[PDB]
């Protein structure tokens, strides 16, 4: 449901025990996202979709 918040600028997901962050493939819609924070999680591979 975060994919619909087109006006987001900061996303903080501290200590959410995120394992896979492949949902980055859907964050290109947000034209104002500048401060994606994913610290304090358990993520292995940064997805190729950062581009």
């Amino acid at each position: 449901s975060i994919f619909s918040l087109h006006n987001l600028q900061e996303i903080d997901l501290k200590d959410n025990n995120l394992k896979t962050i492949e949902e980055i493939i859907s964050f290109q819609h947000l034209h104002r996202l500048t401060c994606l924070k994913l610290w304090y999680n358990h993520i292995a591979y940064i997805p190729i979709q950062i581009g």
């Epitope: 025990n17 394992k19 358990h42 292995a44």
Partner: nanobody, 120 residues
Framework: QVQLVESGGGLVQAGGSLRLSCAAS????????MYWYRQAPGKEREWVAA????????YYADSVKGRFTISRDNAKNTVYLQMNSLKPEDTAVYYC??????????????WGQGTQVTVS
Amino acid sequence: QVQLVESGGGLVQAGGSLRLSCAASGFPVMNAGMYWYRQAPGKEREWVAAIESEGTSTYYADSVKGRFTISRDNAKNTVYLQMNSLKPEDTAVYYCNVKDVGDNHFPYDYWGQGTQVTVS
């Protein structure tokens, strides 16, 4: 509250397959290291199987490596253990163990009641 309990205890002659189980209360199983220990008459608690949190990697002792199978089922909030034609000398009382869950109070090691499985 935090408590550990397992089931599946039953005496089975050599030649069958027994499916153990467990039950964890008060914490998720994914964010915790679950352990299986064996207890035998006249013998102390010997480690058997361990499953690592945040990555789900299985760790086995050379005593029973390559025969057991451990899996974590977060749907039931439990840990399932399966044997593959365990030897008669493998009879023991199996203990579950989870240590240092996200909650940090005086009991740091939680053990199950204990189930006795017999092989003959």
